[PDB]
């Protein structure tokens, strides 16, 4: 009854794609063209009910669509947990290298 | 770097500073040659 | 007039909060269209009471003082949000940013420090319909959150934490493990605060307010090792209006 | 099984200097004349008359 | 506090102007052969 | 010895679970870092019992795969270490799983990689687990060599590793 | 470091007297040295007082009685007996050496003062608890992980970086 | 092992051609890298911003892609940000920008390929050491 | 009566061979700074940083408003050769005075001319020589007076604009201010006279100093000393070493903890960063990095609870949060443009942030005065790459050692002036022991 939250959202997607509401943006760097710019409004616009609403941040240039179009499949969605969000931890999450 | 007109003397003065050292150095070569008087 | 830092420094001036003329009990006026902001608002508290715990049933525990020792660390300032009025004439102050939380500790009688989150994070707070004038008589209550006292990365002093560090007592490898989850599993706790905000000066030439507030909201659960305390805050506030 | 306790709280002393008193009430300044202070004072006089006893 | 503040003041320039009056003395006459 | 003893096993037609429980609990028990005279402590007295436990029963051979159905191997803690991270891995000594410290970049979690426990032999023959922390659980025993069930009240044991009458 | 990080040696009581006899010993050096260089009889005129000592001279070169009443009141006690100070001399030294040996002994076996049980026990269930002690033991434990595959390659150490403990940002 | 020119053989532009550099030439880079650019990136690191490193894989991600001698060469003449989108000529050393960066004054044009080419050879020789940051020293 | 080591011992009362190991000595020094001078030149790179290039005596002439311009871009490097060589070639003349009076010119001064001449137990004679060297001192801080206010100005690393030169029309004179620095506590955010942290007072202070010392000089040539002070004094020629000894290893550890704090006389454009300064310089350069991305470092909270970037102090100013907090203290031209009031305005923090602001923290960031004694910069665990000691850390430790051993030259001869004046340096008299005719304790 007793679980660590951050364990248990390894087990989810979040454990293998970007997850456009928790994950650090950092990982936005694994694919080309998504940082700091996409990567930065992405951020600042969740959290997402599935993983096409990025296509709906307002101030979207096509090419800006495209990439993300380009990317879709690499994205997820889970709730968004407190713990991953919480004190800046997504523009800063404690690691460096 | 230096001015060019002294360019010449560049390896004598990478040497310079120690030169102080020197005296101390010489003051015992100075005391070997008198028996540590 | 005003001062500059080097006539602050060191003085604990830089923990207070801007205050208003006795003279100033006027009223700032709302455009019901036009919309405004709260380009600063301020917080000081002046007084730390925690809730004791009480032993038996029907004797509920009171709230007793406390003595801070953490120093003049504890104000909240440059805060600021969306100033809106809703259909009724209620106004509704939604924060944005802001240096909205400090840690604080304090310590009961006996010795134990209790420490806390002193915050207005995401702070939502109301008037009473039929506004139309910020006066010596308006109140704000709202509700902001309370995130974990410590954030996720921290790490208590065997290594153990939540998103980082061993996940066992690795000091003691083969005790039975069941006795110690409560101290091996980290929780990220998110409570609520409640919040009155009693204005008592207005500038109505400048649009600064002032006065007093309590809120009340949880102490820390040290990552879910033990049970939080009941804390009130009381202190003064200080606000600036703009047309937005 | 305190002792000593009753007999400080029968002539006058109450309250300690972490801020509680023997009456149950909190945010107490007992000043020096605490449970702790009195013990202090009786140390302290335990060690000079520990001296007086040497000069003697 | 503030009386805590005034009364070390107090014992620390005393001991102090002990010190610089002591040495002010004569010290250097202080001792076993030859005194000036 | 003991592989020696189930591999033959198992050529010699035996199941999984027959292999492994014809592994007498007196040769696993001594293939336990428990009984390593050199687990020990100088101040930490008294009989190894008081540490560890009083050995009751050899829980089984505890089996590790990953979701592709690998069997991994958890790396066994050597004398020198009081501690030690959990580490797995394949036959051929590939890392594929561990337990993180630093979870925001981690690759080889348990959740991440499936991991699940099966036991054969001793008192958990023929059961599986999957929940991630109990699979964890075993997998940080499991470093410790084989697994044992322990009676820590008898003696209010500790929990730490003393030395044995070797050792003393 | 290795006995720091894997014994946890500087906790041994047996290096403590080590450090004790050696640290001692280095005191007792220096303090007999500058005392008999200050007590010194005035046997010749020069200012150079080395030229006044003879090998085969029948008296102390400087004077005890001096020397002790100095001591006596700088510091409270002093040595009387020339006998006992020099004897005192070897046995500090030799000592600690002889007590650092018996705890390496003791390492041999990994019979290590590591832990103290009673901090461990409160540690693990108090997770406010914090002293110098757990503090050093953190430390021991980054020392191994990040020395260990180095310092031990027939070991065949693979430790991913997610399993190294860190702080933050470090 | 030795510095062999399979090794020092770099990609020069997108298109697929390759340069062998010599072992002046990276000895060359080399220097450079350590006048111009190590109190950053020692390493392959970016002291500054840990986020963004010098290896292959990360530079071939850039846009436009910097694994290369082209791209390189470009990037400190007008750096970009990752996704190609700004130009941070103000605040990183180049030499569009060697007004204010006065290290960049004296690099010519051949300077910069030895510099791109000690980054795109480095990898090969060093492994994950390069921009692996401390965990690999 | 001393042996070979002790060999300058016998120049005590020797004043002419005494003169000449002075002035061969001061020649030593002056042949030092030229020499030194000429080798930084000879090595200078005017693209670098000084402070990446070794240098410790371009910085000090630089300071002075020779060879640069805004920003400490070093614009003519002349003024460093003529600073050079007329240092080499001054010591020459001092070398020769030098070697002439230790060996050639009369032994002992006394009977040639009764003005040079001198005892050290003549009290009157040594005030006079005292007061000669004051008057000095006093002409040398004008000098400088004279340089900032006539022929140039000084540099100022705080001028409005990146820093510049800039001549100084109005010298601190109010006493209140000069001599409130002598008062103020050493400790920190007070930092007694190393917190000076502008020309103006720098410019009065030296007024000060040398028309003090110049006063002092005519002081001291026109009397004698008083009898509270023949009495607790010991006038002999040691004694006067063991004072002066003192002093300078007090001078030293104010010099060494003047360039590990101060950026105003030692411009962090020359010489590093400090220690503070490059901390601090760290947690504004992910502060800016992290903002950039949408962090809003106002509202962060840090693993511990206290801000990731901003927190306050014990007295509530806003400060840079992290391991820095410590240094709270530092001002410095780059970041004062973001202090309000209450210490860092993050309004300020959010939208006024210069590139020249983002480029400086980056520079000290990376040039904080870490490395190894083999000059790998850096933290100790950093691999070799980046060849660098920051000049302040070979500033301070240099002068930190040479501080101590003089405060251990100082009790050395301190002691023996004592027991040399009362007779007993050279041993106990067996025949005549003190503690032999002194009670016994107990
Ligand atoms: C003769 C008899 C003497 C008896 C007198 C005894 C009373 C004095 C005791 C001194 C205590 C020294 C503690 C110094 C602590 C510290 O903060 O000291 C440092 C201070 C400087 O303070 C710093 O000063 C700084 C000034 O910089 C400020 O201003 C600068 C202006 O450019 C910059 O802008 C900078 O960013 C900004 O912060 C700030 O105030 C810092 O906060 C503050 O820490 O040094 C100073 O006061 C300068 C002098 C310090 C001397 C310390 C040397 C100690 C030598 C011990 C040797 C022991 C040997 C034993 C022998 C056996
Ligand atoms: C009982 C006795 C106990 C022992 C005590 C005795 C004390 C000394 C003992 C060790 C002395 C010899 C060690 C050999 C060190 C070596 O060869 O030293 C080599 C180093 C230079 O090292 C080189 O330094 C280089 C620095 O690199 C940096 O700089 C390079 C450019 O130079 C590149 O740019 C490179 O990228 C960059 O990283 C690299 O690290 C090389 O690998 C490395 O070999 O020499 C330098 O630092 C030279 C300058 C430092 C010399 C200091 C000598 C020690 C001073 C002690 C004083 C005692 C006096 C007391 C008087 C009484
Ligand atoms: C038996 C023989 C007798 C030897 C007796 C031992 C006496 C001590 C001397 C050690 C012997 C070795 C000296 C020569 C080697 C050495 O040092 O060689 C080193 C250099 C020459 O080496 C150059 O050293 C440089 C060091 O970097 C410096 O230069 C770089 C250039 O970019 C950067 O500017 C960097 O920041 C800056 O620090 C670089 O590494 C060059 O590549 C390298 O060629 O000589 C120096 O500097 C010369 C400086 C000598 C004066 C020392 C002054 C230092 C006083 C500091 C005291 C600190 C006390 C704390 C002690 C701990
Ligand atoms: C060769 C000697 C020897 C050995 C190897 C053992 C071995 C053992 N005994 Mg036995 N025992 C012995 C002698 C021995 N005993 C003797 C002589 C007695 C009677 C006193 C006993 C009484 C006894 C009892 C009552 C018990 C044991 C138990 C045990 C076990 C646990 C031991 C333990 O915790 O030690 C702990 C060891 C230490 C903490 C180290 C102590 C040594 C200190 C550090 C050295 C002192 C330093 C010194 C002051 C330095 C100064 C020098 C300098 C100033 C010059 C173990 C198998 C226990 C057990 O489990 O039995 C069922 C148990 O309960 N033993
Ligand atoms: C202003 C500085 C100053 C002056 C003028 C004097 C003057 C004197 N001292 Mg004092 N002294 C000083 C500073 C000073 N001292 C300091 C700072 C210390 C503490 C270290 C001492 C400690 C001291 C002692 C212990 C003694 C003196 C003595 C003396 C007298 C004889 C000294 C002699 O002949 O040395 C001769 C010089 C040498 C033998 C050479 C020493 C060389 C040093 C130790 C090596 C330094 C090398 C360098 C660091 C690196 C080398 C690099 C390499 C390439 C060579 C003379 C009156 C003697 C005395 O009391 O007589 C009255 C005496 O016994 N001095
Ligand atoms: C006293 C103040 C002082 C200071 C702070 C410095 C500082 C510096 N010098 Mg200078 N230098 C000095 C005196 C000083 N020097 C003297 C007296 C000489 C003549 C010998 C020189 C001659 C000199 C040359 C020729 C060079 C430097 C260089 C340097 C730099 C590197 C130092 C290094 O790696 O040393 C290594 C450290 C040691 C050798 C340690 C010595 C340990 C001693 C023996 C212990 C002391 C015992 C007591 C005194 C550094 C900026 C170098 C540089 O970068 O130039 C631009 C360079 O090439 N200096
Ligand atoms: C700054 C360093 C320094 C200086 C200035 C002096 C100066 C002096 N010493 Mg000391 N001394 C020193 C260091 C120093 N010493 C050290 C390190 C030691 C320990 C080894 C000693 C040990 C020592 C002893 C044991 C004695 C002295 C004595 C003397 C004095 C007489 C020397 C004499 O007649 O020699 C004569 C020497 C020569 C004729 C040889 C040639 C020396 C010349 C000067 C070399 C200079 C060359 C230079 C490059 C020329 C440039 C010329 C140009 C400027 C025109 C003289 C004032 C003596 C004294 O007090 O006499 C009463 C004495 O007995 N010294
Ligand atoms: C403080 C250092 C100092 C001191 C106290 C002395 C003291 C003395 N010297 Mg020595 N001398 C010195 C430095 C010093 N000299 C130097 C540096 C040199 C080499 C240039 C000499 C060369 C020298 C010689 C050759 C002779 C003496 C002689 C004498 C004696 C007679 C002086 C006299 O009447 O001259 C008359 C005075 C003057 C002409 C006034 C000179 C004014 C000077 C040039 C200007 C001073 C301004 C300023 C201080 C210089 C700084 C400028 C610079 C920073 C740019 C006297 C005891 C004589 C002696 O003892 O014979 C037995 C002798 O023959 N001296
Ligand atoms: C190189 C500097 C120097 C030296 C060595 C001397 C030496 C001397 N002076 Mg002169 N003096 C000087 C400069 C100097 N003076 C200057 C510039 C002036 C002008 C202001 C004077 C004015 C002066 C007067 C008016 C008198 C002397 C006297 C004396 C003699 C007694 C000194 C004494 O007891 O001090 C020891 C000092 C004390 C016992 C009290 C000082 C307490 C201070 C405040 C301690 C502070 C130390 C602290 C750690 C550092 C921080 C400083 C603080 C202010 C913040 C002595 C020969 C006396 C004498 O006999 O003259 C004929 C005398 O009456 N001096
Ligand atoms: C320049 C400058 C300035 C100024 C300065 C000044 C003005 C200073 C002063 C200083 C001073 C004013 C000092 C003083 C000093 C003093 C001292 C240091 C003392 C000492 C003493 C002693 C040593 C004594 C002792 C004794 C005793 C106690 C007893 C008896 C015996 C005897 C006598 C021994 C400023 C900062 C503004 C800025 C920058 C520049």
Known sequence: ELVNVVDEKLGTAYGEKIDLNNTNIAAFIQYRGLYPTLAKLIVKNAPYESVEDVLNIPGLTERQKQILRENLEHFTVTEVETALVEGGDRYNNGLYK | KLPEAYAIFDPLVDVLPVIPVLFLALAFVWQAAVGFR | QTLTYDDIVGTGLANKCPTLDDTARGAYPIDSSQTYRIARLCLQPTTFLVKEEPKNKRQEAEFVPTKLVTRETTSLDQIQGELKVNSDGS?????????????????????????????????????????????????????????????????????????????????????????????????????????????????????????????????????????????????????????? | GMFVLPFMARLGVTGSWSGWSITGETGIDPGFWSFEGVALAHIVLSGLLFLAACWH | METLKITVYIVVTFFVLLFVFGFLSGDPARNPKRKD | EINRRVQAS??????????????????????????????????????????????????????????????????????????????????????????????????????????????????????????????????????????????????????????????? | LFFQGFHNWTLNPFHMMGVAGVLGGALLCAIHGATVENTLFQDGEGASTFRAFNPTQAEETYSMVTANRFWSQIFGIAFSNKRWLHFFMLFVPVTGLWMSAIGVVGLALNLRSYDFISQEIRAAEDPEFETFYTKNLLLNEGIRAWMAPQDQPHENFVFPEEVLPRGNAL | ??????????????????????????????????????????????????????????????????????????????????????????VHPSLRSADIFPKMRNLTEKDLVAIAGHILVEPKILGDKWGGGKVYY | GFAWWAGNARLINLSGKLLGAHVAHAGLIVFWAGAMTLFELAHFIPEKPMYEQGLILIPHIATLGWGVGPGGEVVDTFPFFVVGVVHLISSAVLGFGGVYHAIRGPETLEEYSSFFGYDWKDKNKMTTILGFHLIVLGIGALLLVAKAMFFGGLYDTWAPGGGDVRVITNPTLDPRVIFGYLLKSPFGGEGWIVSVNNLEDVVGGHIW????????????????????????????????????????????????????????????????????????????????????????????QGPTGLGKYLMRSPTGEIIFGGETMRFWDFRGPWLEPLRGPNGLDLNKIKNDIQPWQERRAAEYMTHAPLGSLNSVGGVATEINSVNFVSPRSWLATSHFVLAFFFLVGHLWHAGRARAAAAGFEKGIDRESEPVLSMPSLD
């Not at chain 9, 454009?269 to 992290?290: C, K, N, V, W």
């Open chain 9, 209 to 300: 100093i040398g028309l003090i010392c110049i006063a002092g000089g005519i002081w001291h040539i026109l009397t004698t000393p008083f009898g509270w002070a023949r009495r607790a004094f010991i006038w002999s020629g040691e004694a006067y070493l063991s004072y002066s000894l003192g002093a300078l290893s007090m001078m030293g550890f104010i010099a060494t903890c003047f360039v590990w704090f101060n950026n105003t006389v030692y411009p962090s454009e020359f010489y590093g960063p400090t220690g503070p300064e490059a901390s601090q310089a760290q947690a504004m350069t992910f502060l800016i990095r992290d903002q950039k991305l949408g962090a809003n470092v106002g509202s962060a």
């Open chain 3, 91 to 244: 106004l509704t102050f939604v924060e944005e940013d802001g240096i909205d939380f400090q840690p604080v500790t304090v310590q009961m009688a006996g010795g134990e420090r209790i420490p806390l989150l002193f915050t207005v994070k995401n702070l939502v707070a109301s008037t009473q319909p039929n506004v139309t004038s910020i006066t010596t008589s308006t109140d704000f209550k709202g509700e902001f959150n309370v995130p974990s006292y410590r954030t996720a990365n921290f790490l208590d002093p065997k290594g153990r934490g939540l998103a980082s560090g061993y996940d066992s007592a690795i000091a003691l490898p083969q005790a039975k493990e069941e006795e110690l989850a409560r101290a091996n599993v980290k929780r990220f706790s998110l409570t609520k605060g409640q919040i009155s905000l009693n204005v008592a000066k207005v500038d109505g030439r400048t649009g600064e307010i002032a006065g007093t507030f309590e809120s009340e909201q949880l102490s820390d659960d040290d990552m879910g090792a033990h049970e939080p305390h009941e804390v009130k805050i009381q202190g003064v506030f200080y606000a600036s209006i703009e047309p937005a």
């Open chain 6, 10 to 168: 198992l050529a010699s037609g035996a199941t999984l679970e027959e292999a492994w429980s014809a592994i007498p609990e007196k040769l696993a028990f001594y293939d336990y870092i428990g009984n390593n005279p050199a687990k020990g402590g100088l101040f930490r007295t008294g009989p190894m019992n008081k540490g560890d436990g009083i050995a009751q029963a050899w829980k089984g051979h505890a089996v590790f795969r990953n979701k592709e159905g690998e069997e991994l191997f958890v790396r066994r803690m050597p004398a020198f270490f009081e501690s030690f991270p959990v580490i797995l891995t394949d036959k051929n000594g590939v890392v594929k799983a561990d337990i993180p410290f630093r979870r925001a970049e981690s690759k080889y979690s348990f959740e991440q990689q499936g991991v699940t426990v099966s036991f054969y032999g001793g008192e958990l023959n023929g059961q599986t687990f999957t929940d991630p922390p109990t699979v964890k659980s075993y997998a940080r025993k499991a470093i410790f060599g084989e697994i044992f069930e322990f009676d820590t009240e008898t003696l209010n044991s500790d929990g730490i590793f003393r030395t044995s009458p070797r050792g003393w």
């Open chain 8, 1 to 90: 092992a030795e510095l062999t020119p399979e090794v020092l053989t770099v990609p020069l532009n997108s298109e697929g051609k390759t340069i062998t550099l010599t072992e002046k030439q990276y000895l060359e880079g080399k220097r450079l890298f350590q006048y111009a650019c190590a109190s950053c990136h020692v390493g392959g690191i970016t002291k500054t911003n840990p986020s963004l490193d010098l290896r292959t894989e990360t530079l071939a991600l850039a846009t436009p892609p910097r694994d290369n001698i082209e791209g390189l060469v470009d990037y400190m003449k007008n750096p970009t940000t990752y996704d190609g989108e700004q130009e941070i000529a103000e």
